[PDB]
Symmetry: D2
Subunit: 481 residues, 4 copies
């Protein structure tokens, strides 16, 4: 069979090898048509209707581009078409574990529904990949195209999830180390996955992207670093790399962590939690699963998509009333009310196990103001957001290797002070958003008082609108004035 | 409650008047989030994931822009903000009647499922608008903002569907005739609906748009034409108008009538037909409706979206197997095979009552060829496509009024001969596509022989691949040599 | 000496081989930075400030892209590194013969200044290329990078200008005929030169076209046609090809032949004609040349760019007063006034021999109206423009070869009747613009009367604004209603 | 007479009031067509051929957009069409004082040619505006459109250059203070000039823009701040503001201060210095001026554009030989060699009085390497570049006023700590680039040794490629290891 050409609004005309086509045309891959890339973000940015499917095509394409470029500039690397196909397949299949509304599912729902389990999106992708391969007879097509299914399937999985557990990989040896930096870069976070979603999300959101992946590809080489051949960027391109991470941060501030988008993800998750006992998804054998248990059976998970939303919204069963009602309130735009935003000060970090107690803290605050209404713990929502450069408190550029034009095969390192003094001094912070479920004027007022008092007691930052929303609280706070 | 700003990737930041927001935040309008603008086109162009929702937003916005422009350039027209709001509401609500997969529903499915009924997309939009209004207490909100519900609701409906069936409109008199030309121009098809979907579809498909609606708006005026005030374009802009329709035609040939997109629409429709007896959609009172009859109850139709596709796909009920299988074959990319394309010659038009007889005609033919495998009528699909400039055989530019720079309040007409000799000689044609449901090598060979013989017998145009797919048949037709 | 990466707003990051860089960094090439691509068009479209330099880079690049794609899809063509470099150089240098204001120079100025000489842009490019090579010691660099200067220099020139005097080319044999279809396609006009200026001019003008060269490249193959290996397009891409020419026509209608742009080209050409005796350009040995004779010495022509405009504009010598004044009137925007536009009918063409005589005719007509101030022939300008599909009366798609997917190695032909009846029936037409050098109210009125009467007498098309500018004249002609 | 529509690739179709058209169609304004926006940058980014003309149109337009938007949103500000016209004219004319290659002229050339005179670009623009007005009879045209020349010309000048001397402005009273923040914001640098060149320069450079000015305009209001009426942004837009300045910094890093671009500006400046004694520009009365003295006579400065470059390049006079040689060395791409880049450490700032002594410091350094060639001070170039957020050491966002959704007319302040911990800690830094005029391998090696030795001695930052370009020097510095 022959190659297919496909037209993508981001990358243009992409060539798809017949093996890739065989992989794409399976229920396991096509399911990605029914999962929105940005989930609840679509309910704030109406252009964001794009799905995981097209993004996956993009990542496969981009993975291919990088490996190809590397190969043509450096034939001594012995990059084979087999290598190219494996990196392409890895890029294509990286997101196969996506659940309903993408990262709402693994980031919000599963942690609340199944706290005992260790679930990652990537593990999901490996399992779903295995299921695709075994359910569609892919191994003989792989062999037909020069792949060796054992090592190569191992390699693809390793590209997606990391080492399956000092060279920890089995799919490829150290002299092909660079191949593991293409799809998901565990070392510094610089990969083609990011490059695709920056561009694609920007295209759909109506926000413009300022990162040029093509330039990066032009300037990329492979050099020896610690007895492995790794990808190195050109030294003077370091500025661009800092900008890339800045871009990432910007996209999170403007879109991915938009206050309303997040509150909508929250409400939908609440609906799924109230629906979990009663929704049935039929997997292997005819066995029944729940939304929270579909992850245990790939045939059921294959059928778990954004559809569940609509299944709940359109239901007539009384047992789903509660869930249904919540979704209906989303349609009427009767959302939880944003009360405010604050940050911790000094060294103070908030841990996830402390998240659960935060609404209790806010309601327990004691403002010295006349309050019509007393508010409870369940009236508040506290969303904690980690904003960083992808490596917690670390500078990812400290984990990038560079080359100089005068000696292109010699890897070097570049420190932050060698670049600019206008760069961040810290690379991680927390944003605390507080919302109130009671929508009346007085409850909202009260909630503002509770919130600002709470910020004052914990020495958090002064809310930007503090002097307007709670003028009796902010002045009696040494700093904030 | 204040105005909202929304960020659209096509138009940028749009202001939404609180009345519009009240209309948008209803189940009848939010419903459009679950219907793909281009339906089956998404299975060919992976960027085409956009839904009717954002498009309706865009059209409302642009209607607003045009009316506002007309108003600020010519205050003597007495355009009120009430007029602006009514025009905006009409733009927002024109597609309220969209069914699953947009024009697949009213264009393919409903005509086959219920041939006796006269259902149009627009009338559907009117009924759904009425339903939204009554189910959400909009009338007093309209009144709150200076609208007069009887006249204005009548006006909005008239803008969507035309005269509800001597000046035929009741919502506005002849001296505001131009207002009826903004949302859906029944006279020549030049309206803001088209502008939005050209721009938007081009953005998602990965095809670049070459029509400049902002320029058109800049050059628009209103002049007296036969005792009504109508929209007139600048004379010198006539070329652009021809180009617009050319653009329209291009999009239809590149995207909207794509051979695979159409066969996918055909298969989906076939599945919906096979599922029709068994799917239940709960409408008013709790009464059950089917996919083909949901159009009889707006409460039921509200819940009729692209979701059914998945409901059929995810089903386990044996009664749905047939339907299900069809959808599954789409997932495996086992589509009916494109055999070829031809056109009629001379004066010959194919009428709709004769569509049904075309596969039998193809199935008949005597290719005088080595007869491999015999094929039956039910093995063929024949799709007839009417390609025109929107007014059947008529030139729409003959129904446009122009003004010249030396006398901008004086309307004139421009004939085709006054423009260019490189323009089309005909403004309507028919396209005949033939596919075969038997997908094997020999069946395909056979189908090609039957098809070319059929083209020869009907004196149709010679297929482009004719000399290759049927080399024993093409020489027997002098005209083709 | 390594490759350089250069960033182009149209094509992105382009790689330039050291040989190409050596060619670029010469006075003969850098000269193209000082010559505007669209000449007078910048005085109508303020974004059109781009120069021939960047465009030449673009064409070199695209030429390379096409030949590389062909090579990798079909290794049996034996396309060498040398072939790629020669085609790139051809693209790079196809415009070396550009004169001040580009096509104003060879299209308007030289024919008026020296009607006896045979000057073309292409021959100018061959001459300038020879000069660049010889003045900068390029030949040994060519051999240093694997080129064979005699054969390859011949090949490059042939790519630019066509056969230097049956297989007429000496640079490459018939089995590489396809290489001659890349930079300048004399057979059908489909080349990378067009692709680049379509994209670039659109980028700068602020108008967009819908032609996708990248898609074309994806679908291009080389097949056998008449003992030649020629480039063939995929059959179903024929529509796009027709569209490509539509695009061309549109760009000419909107931008390249803009009425005001053309009148500015006319005025600048007049200033240059009036300046020719007095501007001195120093050529070889120190010999002096004029603007019209610099083409006789490449050392002088090297210094002949748009700069001359400013020299004339900034001059103080009385011998240049006339030239200067004209340019000054351009700065004050006192341009000749457009009076109107009309066309001839079907089978009769106006050939160059009559252009000179057209103003006398207009002034000669006797419009039965009160006109106080009579105009002479010298008060008029008549610009007639040939609009075609690039091959006079011919359909260029009749000269395109195609292949179908069932047999990609077999070239076939496709007729207009096989594609659509919505296409043009004719492929060439003439446009007549009339201007008046007298700019006062009464002179303008008079001019309108004369012009419309002239249209009436000659049975040309009715001017679009005819009933407005000459309401006393149009009633004498029944056909015009 | 009437308005003109003009098509700009950045802003689309702009309307120009007849007064603006009158101002534009003068030699003083049209002059801007012959001065490149980015000067020497065109010799690095080939798309950057745009001139000051189109940019000035853009700023006029945007100024109009902002004042207009403020006007419809808050009629209580009493913004008149007279105010709108005056702001448009100021935007239109802010750059009239541009010299050849824009900021090369006022930034490099004039300080070297005439260090005694105090010339700014802005004062230049004011003088040139006065000249335009007086030489073209603009005043009665101003009066014709409702403007009052005495007050209004003053207003325009004040908008460009600031107070010509409580409330320091005379053109408009304090209740129109916000009008002075539109074209050139002397308070915090947030103005429409920046918005336009960010967008335009990005469009031409092939760099993508990340700032959304339209969104800013939607969220802009006027509020009372410290007994003055100022433009305030919505609180939540604070992030966008920080990003805006980041964007600015990025544009300076990638394009405006590109090392090769700067060295090309440097060489051009030297050529102008060697040409100054010999080039003649004819000013008022017939008096002769130099490149360096043309600023003393507006009639002469009108004729001072990028043309001088070509005059020098095309000259034959022996007295200009040296100058000529320099330009020729640019054409052959024989440029001064970039040696390296470094920064001071800690609190150490380099003072401007010390710039001249730096090449001497570098040449005086004694690297312990065996050198063939010794270099002198005149062989080195040391470029010190101030990179900041537009207000030297200050955070400009500390000089921005914000408003909250709950009380849109109550201005507030927002501190850096209320926004993010990932923001710059410093807002100003110094960049030191070193180049060598000797271009042979050995001199370049030597220059590198001298340079890195100098960096070590001054305790500057370690050059990024230090260990590669100078491996015998870097180990001597503990701080660098
Ligand atoms: N004229 C066009 N311009 C831009 N994109 C197009 C055009 N036509 C189709 N596309 C898109 C749709 C697909 O995503 C991709 C490939 O389409 P296409 O070439 O029509 O494949 P196809 O499979 O239907 O034809 P075939 O099987 O005969 O090769 O490009
Ligand atoms: N920084 C941004 N840049 C571009 N678009 C944005 C940005 N932030 C949000 N958007 C989009 C999302 C929405 O479509 C639109 C409005 O967003 P936003 O201003 O955040 O409204 P909001 O309703 O959440 O805030 P508020 O109610 O306080 O005014 O702009
Ligand atoms: N950060 C950037 N982003 C986009 N384009 C850039 C950037 N920096 C430079 N450019 C452009 C300018 C040129 O057209 C092209 C090449 O520039 P550049 O990489 O700086 O080459 P260079 O010759 O100055 O460096 P070097 O010789 O050290 O390799 O890219
Ligand atoms: N069809 C077009 N599409 C886009 N831009 C155009 C088109 N035609 C012209 N332009 C540009 C060029 C100018 O910048 C601007 C105005 O052009 P145009 O409307 O033709 O002015 P004009 O002065 O020649 O006509 P007139 O004086 O008769 O109204 O738009
Ligand atoms: Mg809001
Ligand atoms: Zn991903
Ligand atoms: Zn529509
Ligand atoms: Zn060209």
């Amino acid at each position: 069979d022959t190659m297919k050409v496909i037209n993508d609004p981001i990358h243009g005309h992409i060539e798809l090898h017949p093996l890739l086509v065989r992989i794409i045309d399976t229920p396991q891959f096509q399911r990605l048509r029914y999962i929105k890339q940005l989930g609840g973000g679509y309910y704030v940015f109406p252009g964001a209707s794009h799905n995981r499917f097209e993004h996956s095509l993009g990542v496969g394409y981009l993975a291919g581009c990088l490996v190809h470029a590397l190969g043509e500039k450096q034939p001594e690397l012995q990059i084979s078409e087999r290598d190219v196909l494996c990196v392409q397949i890895a890029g294509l299949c990286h997101d196969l574990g996506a659940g309903p509304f993408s990262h709402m599912f693994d980031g919000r729902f599963i942690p609340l529904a199944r706290p005992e389990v260790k679930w990652t999106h990537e593990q999901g992708s490996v399992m779903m990949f295995e299921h695709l391969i075994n359910s569609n007879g892919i191994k003989p097509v792989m062999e037909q195209y020069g792949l060796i299914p054992e090592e190569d399937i191992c390699f693809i999985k390793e590209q997606i999830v990391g080492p399956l557990e000092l060279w920890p990989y089995k799919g490829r040896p150290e002299n092909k180390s660079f191949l593991y930096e293409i799809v998901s870069n565990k070392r510094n976070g610089i990969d083609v996955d990011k490059w695709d979603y920056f561009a694609r999300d920007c295209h759909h959101l109506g926000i413009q992207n300022n990162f040029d992946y093509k330039r990066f590809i032009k300037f990329a080489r492979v050099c020896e670093v610690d007895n492995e051949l790794r990808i190195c960027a050109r030294d003077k391109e370091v500025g661009n790399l800092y900008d890339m991470f800045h871009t990432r941060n910007s996209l999170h501030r403007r879109a991915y962590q938009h206050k309303v988008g997040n509150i909508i993800d929250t409400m939908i998750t609440d609906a799924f939690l109230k629906a979990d006992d009663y929704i049935e998804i039929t997997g292997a054998g005819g066995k029944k699963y729940r939304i929270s248990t579909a992850i245990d059976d790939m045939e059921a998970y294959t059928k778990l998509t954004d559809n569940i939303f609509l299944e709940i919204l359109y239901s007539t069963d009384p047992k789903l009333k509660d869930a249904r009602e919540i979704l209906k309130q989303i349609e009427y735009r009767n959302l939880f009310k944003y009360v405010g935003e604050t940050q911790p000060t000094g060294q103070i970090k908030i841990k996830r196990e402390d998240y659960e107690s935060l609404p209790k803290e806010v309601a327990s605050a004691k403002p010295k103001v006349l309050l019509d209404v007393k508010l409870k713990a369940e009236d508040f929502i506290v969303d904690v957001i980690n904003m960083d450069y992808g490596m917690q408190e670390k500078n990812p550029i400290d984990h990038v290797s560079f080359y100089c034009k005068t000696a292109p095969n010699r890897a070097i390192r570049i420190t932050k002070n060698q670049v600019s003094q206008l760069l961040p001094e810290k690379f991680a912070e927390q944003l605390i958003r507080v919302y109130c479920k009671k929508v009346d004027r007085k409850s909202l007022y009260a909630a503002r008082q509770y919130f600002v008092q709470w910020c004052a007691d914990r020495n958090f930052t002064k809310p930007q609108d503090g002097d307007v929303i709670a003028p009796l609280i902010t002045p009696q706070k040494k700093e904030w004035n």
